[PDB]
Amino acid sequence: RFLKVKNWETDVVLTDTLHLKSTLETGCTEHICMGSIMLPSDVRTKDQLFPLAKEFLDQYYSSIKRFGSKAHMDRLEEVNKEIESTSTYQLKDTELIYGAKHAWRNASRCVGRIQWSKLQVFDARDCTTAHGMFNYICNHVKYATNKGNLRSAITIFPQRTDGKHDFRVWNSQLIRYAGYKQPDGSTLGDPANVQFTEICIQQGWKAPRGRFDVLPLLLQANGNDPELFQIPPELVLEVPIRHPKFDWFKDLGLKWYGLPAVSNMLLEIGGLEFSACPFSGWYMGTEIGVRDYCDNSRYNILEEVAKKMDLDMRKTSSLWKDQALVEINIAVLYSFQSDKVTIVDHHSATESFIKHMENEYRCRGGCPADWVWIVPPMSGSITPVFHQEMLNYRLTPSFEYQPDPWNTHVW
Amino acid sequence: RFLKVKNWETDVVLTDTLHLKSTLETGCTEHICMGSIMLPVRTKDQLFPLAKEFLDQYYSSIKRFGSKAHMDRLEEVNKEIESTSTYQLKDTELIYGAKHAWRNASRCVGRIQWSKLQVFDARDCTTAHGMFNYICNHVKYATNKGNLRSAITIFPQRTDGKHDFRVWNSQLIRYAGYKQPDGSTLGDPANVQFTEICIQQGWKAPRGRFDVLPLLLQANGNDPELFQIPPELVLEVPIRHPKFDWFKDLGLKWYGLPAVSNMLLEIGGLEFSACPFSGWYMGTEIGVRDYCDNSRYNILEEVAKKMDLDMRKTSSLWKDQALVEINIAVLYSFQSDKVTIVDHHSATESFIKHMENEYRCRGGCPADWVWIVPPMSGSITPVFHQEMLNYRLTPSFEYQPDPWNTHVWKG
Numbered sequence: 001r002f003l004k005v006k007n008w009e010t011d012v013v014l015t016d017t018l019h020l021k022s023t024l025e026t027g028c029t030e031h032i033c034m035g036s037i038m039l040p041s042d043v044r045t046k047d048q049l050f051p052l053a054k055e056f057l058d059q060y061y062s063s064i065k066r067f068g069s070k071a072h073m074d075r076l077e078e079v080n081k082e083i084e085s086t087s088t089y090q091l092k093d094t095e096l097i098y099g100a101k102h103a104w105r106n107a108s109r110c111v112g113r114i115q116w117s118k119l120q121v122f123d124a125r126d127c128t129t130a131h132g133m134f135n136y137i138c139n140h141v142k143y144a145t146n147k148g149n150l151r152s153a154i155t156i157f158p159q160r161t162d163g164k165h166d167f168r169v170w171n172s173q174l175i176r177y178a179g180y181k182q183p184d185g186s187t188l189g190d191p192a193n194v195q196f197t198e199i200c201i202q203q204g205w206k207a208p209r210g211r212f213d214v215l216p217l218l219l220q221a222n223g224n225d226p227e228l229f230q231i232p233p234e235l236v237l238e239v240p241i242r243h244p245k246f247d248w249f250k251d252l253g254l255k256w257y258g259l260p261a262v263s264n265m266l267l268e269i270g271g272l273e274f275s276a277c278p279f280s281g282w283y284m285g286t287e288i289g290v291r292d293y294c295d296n297s298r299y300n301i302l303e304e305v306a307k308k309m310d311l312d313m314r315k316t317s318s319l320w321k322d323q324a325l326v327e328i329n330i331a332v333l334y335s336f337q338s339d340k341v342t343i344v345d346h347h348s349a350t351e352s353f354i355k356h357m358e359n360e361y362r363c364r365g366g367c368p369a370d371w372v373w374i375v376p377p378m379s380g381s382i383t384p385v386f387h388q389e390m391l392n393y394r395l396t397p398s399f400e401y402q403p404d405p406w407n408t409h410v411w
Numbered sequence: 412r413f414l415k416v417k418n419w420e421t422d423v424v425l426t427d428t429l430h431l432k433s434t435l436e437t438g439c440t441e442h443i444c445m446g447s448i449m450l451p452v453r454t455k456d457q458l459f460p461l462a463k464e465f466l467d468q469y470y471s472s473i474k475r476f477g478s479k480a481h482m483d484r485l486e487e488v489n490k491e492i493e494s495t496s497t498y499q500l501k502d503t504e505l506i507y508g509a510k511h512a513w514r515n516a517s518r519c520v521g522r523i524q525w526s527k528l529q530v531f532d533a534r535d536c537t538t539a540h541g542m543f544n545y546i547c548n549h550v551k552y553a554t555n556k557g558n559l560r561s562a563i564t565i566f567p568q569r570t571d572g573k574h575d576f577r578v579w580n581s582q583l584i585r586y587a588g589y590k591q592p593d594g595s596t597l598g599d600p601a602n603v604q605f606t607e608i609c610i611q612q613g614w615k616a617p618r619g620r621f622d623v624l625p626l627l628l629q630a631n632g633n634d635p636e637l638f639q640i641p642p643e644l645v646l647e648v649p650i651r652h653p654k655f656d657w658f659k660d661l662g663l664k665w666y667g668l669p670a671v672s673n674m675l676l677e678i679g680g681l682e683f684s685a686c687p688f689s690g691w692y693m694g695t696e697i698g699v700r701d702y703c704d705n706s707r708y709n710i711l712e713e714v715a716k717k718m719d720l721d722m723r724k725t726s727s728l729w730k731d732q733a734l735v736e737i738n739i740a741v742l743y744s745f746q747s748d749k750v751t752i753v754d755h756h757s758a759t760e761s762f763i764k765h766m767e768n769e770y771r772c773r774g775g776c777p778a779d780w781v782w783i784v785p786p787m788s789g790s791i792t793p794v795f796h797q798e799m800l801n802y803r804l805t806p807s808f809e810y811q812p813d814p815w816n817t818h819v820w821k822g
């Protein structure tokens with residue numbers, strides 16, 4: 001009941017008590033582990049909402065060393081009064097900032113959480129239209145990009161009410177490249193976005209049908225139909241990809257954007273649901289070089305790179321795929337570091353996370369962590385997280401997945 | 412109840428019903444996932460249901476469920492248990508049980524081969540000298556001059572837990588490790604504790620960097636005894652690189668036969684505490700883990716030095732570069748000496764085919780993603796993208812405590 005995690009490279013053993021505070025469910029049972037399932041998982045009735053608010057307020061006032069205080073009980077009664085009457089409640093700015101930082105802090109799949117306390121929270125709860133959402137998002141992009149000195153940020157749009165007036169960003173990320181099918185059968189641009197790249201065209205967009213076309217924003221306010229907006233190109237920081245040794249690398253014609261900005265998740269704070277909460281940080285190099293470029297279902301450039309290196313692609317045991325993979329990821333890091341755009345390699349990021357884990361075990365009693373997501377997609381066992389046992393459990397406040405809006409939108 | 416797993420690279424969806432036959436527990440609950448935890452006496456009372464379950468499965472597989480042979484065997488095992496408190500497996504049952512313990516091993520990527528296991532019945536063995544003889548014959552048979560063959564040798568089952576057969580070596584063939592007074596280590600740092608035990612038991616240590624450890628063998632609960640495997644039975648491979656002529660000068664070699672000898676085989680409630688089994692290597696086991704773990708031979712630096720990589724900043728990916736070259740060298744050396752080995756691309760591709768076949772013919776394939784995904788180049792192998800369900804079937808291989816921690820010494 002008081003659990004232990006061992007690092008098998010260092011024998012460091014930490015004891016976890018934070019999991020006992022867990023509230024939600026994992027999808028696992030004593031009979032079957034679902035640890036490798038990508039996604040396990042209406043108006044919150046008045047009965048369900050108040051305990052959720054109380055648990056959240058309790059930890060908030062605990063964290064400011066005012067648990068069981070004057071203002072604690074007052075705020076507890078005031079929110080209880082507000083739920084009994086309005087059937088919801090509004091967070092104070094301070095509570096909102098705490099809830100957002102702690103949603104990041106509790107994100108067991110995120111290797112970058114050592115930075116959790118430095119998040120910049122933009123309160124967009126006064127927003128009413130998609131033009132206004134576009135305005136809030138442009139300011140977010142510009143603030144976070146910071147001319148390449150990237151800064152973490154989240155912008156929080158108004159919370160769900162009856163499920164009919166949902167604020168949604170239809171893009172999965174604020175900045176992504178278009179993808180189109182070819183008349184023959186191949187795919188031009190990013191194959192992961194083919195369905196969305198169409199719903200943009202199949203709703204108004206005029207595509208250059210290039211390979212790296214920055215998609216427009218599809219923004220939905222108060223449950224209305226979504227609207228297209230182009231992010232000002234001067235706000236989208238992009239990096240051409242060259243190699244520090246191979247001058248033909250430049251000729252491959254590769255680029256990527258500097259700002260990773262997830263926009264399709266649901267932020268849950270004290271029972272309240274924020275369906276539109278785009279957040280952004282900076283990249284770990286393998287996200288681009290390993291996954292975006294080398295996934296067979298994505299840009300899938302391994303074959304053409306290996307050919308230009310003139311590797312023996314006859315037999316898999318020559319490890320030509322692994323060799324190209326390394327070079328591709330050297331170039332990504334080299335390109336960002338040269339153009340002065342923040343990026344972290346998987347060695348630094350995982351070493352940071354071990355230090356963060358030991359901070360969380362020491363000052364909080366644990367850190368929920370999903371090994372399947374934390375270990376990088378290359379060179380797994382030469383990073384320290386590979387040898388780190390991790391306990392995965394769900395704390396709140398949290399970021400949660402939510403249905404794609406086009407499947408849900410009463411159009 | 413049915414359960415689905417999705418391959419996110421191909422969208423292939425499989426349906427698991429086999430998890431319904433799962434008995435043992437995983438360690439996970441609805442509130443915590445223990446998926447990354449490395450490691451998460453028996454009376455007549457509980458033994459006959461375990462025997463019945465195993466014999467029902469055995470007779471089902473041979474299309475004889477409910478037959479007179481089946482009913483007679485159940486009755487015969489019933490009486491033998493109530494009269495003698497244990498029972499003996501027929502040869503057919505033992506072979507079936509050991510193959511299925513491998514087939515059920517959710518952490519094993521090599522299970523496509525499970526039906527071709529060569530089973531050696533050593534249940535008539537009575538002394539450590541007799542154990543040495545059986546293990547020598549196993550090593551010679553399994554090695555087969557480099558054309559490796561899977562094999563398991565099965566010593567007598569546990570009785571009262573005070574007469575166990577045990578192989579004290581964790582693997583049949585392993586290199587010694589010696590802690591020096593200056594704190595440094597000569598040989599395999601993983602084996603320092605076991606090396607010390609061997610020396611204390613009388614082994615004259617050559618004190619080199621690749622000394623094959625003696626066998627320490629325990630029969631019938633007696634004190635263990637030292638034996639030296641004939642060197643002509645220990646097939647080894649000098650490690651050279653196909654492009655880097657300086658790589659041979661690193662002085663590296665490895666043995667050809669991976670043979671795990673510290674696990675416990677459970678069949679129908681019976682416990683076989685000495686059951687060495689052997690296959691052939693996946694290249695990464697040597698090149699990634701054995702050579703490049705920080706806690707093992709740890710040659711990343713000296714390799715990256717001789718390669719003259721930028722070793723000042725990790726973002727140069729010198730560690731990942733040297734890792735690939737070392738793993739190319741291991742595969743090249745084994746193939747050149749015609750010693751069986753499989754690279755991680757071939758092995759994971761075969762496992763996906765195996766897994767899909769098992770879903771079709773068997774209703775499931777329990778699988779531990781944390782262990783199946785290789786320790787380098789994770790996401791460019793197809794298992795990274797495969798959802799897996801982990802559960803426990805019997806017959807099974809289990810961990811057991813190291814015998815030096817439990818043995819009662821006779822003197």
Ligand code: HEM
Binds near residue numbers: 154280281282373
């Ligand atoms: C600042 C540097 C950051 C780094 C280096 C980083 C790194 C990562 C990486 C590599 C992943 C794996 C995701 C994938 O493979 O697709 C991830 C997941 C995640 N990150 Fe972070 N991240 C950062 C900032 C943030 C911020 C600012 C937030 C929220 C405020 C956040 C929340 C999350 C969440 C919720 C997930 C998992 C979501 C899912 O299940 O898909 N991250 N992060």
Ligand code: HEM
Binds near residue numbers: 519563693
């Ligand atoms: C024939 C080729 C085989 C290959 C390529 C192979 C490969 C592997 C690998 C790479 C692992 C991961 C273990 C580690 O990283 O230390 C593993 C685990 C395992 N293998 Fe296989 N294996 C083979 C044959 C066998 C055989 C013949 C058996 C038993 C009859 C077996 C039983 C197991 C078991 C029980 C585990 C679990 C290890 C543990 O939990 O410590 N394997 N295998």
Ligand SMILES: Cc1cc(N)nc(CCc2cc(CC[C@H]3COCCN3C)cc(F)c2F)c1
Binds near residue numbers: 279281282
């Ligand atoms: C803030 C931030 C920093 C950083 N370094 N990277 C990211 C993007 C990774 C990321 C991705 C996703 C989407 C998950 C889906 C997308 O479809 C492919 C399969 N995948 C399961 C959610 C996140 F919450 C997240 F974080 C975000």
Ligand SMILES: Cc1cc(N)nc(CCc2cc(CC[C@H]3COCCN3C)cc(F)c2F)c1
Binds near residue numbers: 670690692
């Ligand atoms: C039959 C066979 C084929 C093949 N290709 N490889 C092997 C060796 C891998 C292997 C290794 C181990 C050791 C388990 C723990 C011990 O503590 C340190 C960490 N270590 C993981 C057990 C196995 F059961 C096993 F299989 C065996």
Ligand SMILES: C[C@H](O)[C@H](O)[C@H]1CNc2nc(N)[nH]c(=O)c2N1
Binds near residue numbers: 447448
């Ligand atoms: C903590 C973690 O479970 C541990 O490092 C595991 C991870 N996956 C592994 N996978 C394999 N094949 N072998 C291992 O030893 C390990 N070690």
Ligand SMILES: C[C@H](O)[C@H](O)[C@H]1CNc2nc(N)[nH]c(=O)c2N1
Binds near residue numbers: 037038374797
């Ligand atoms: C099936 C498996 O869960 C899936 O491929 C996961 C594995 N681990 C991952 N890890 C990260 N960081 N990101 C991912 O998208 C995935 N995908």
Ligand SMILES: [Zn+2]
Binds near residue numbers: 028032034035444446
């Ligand atoms: Zn689990």
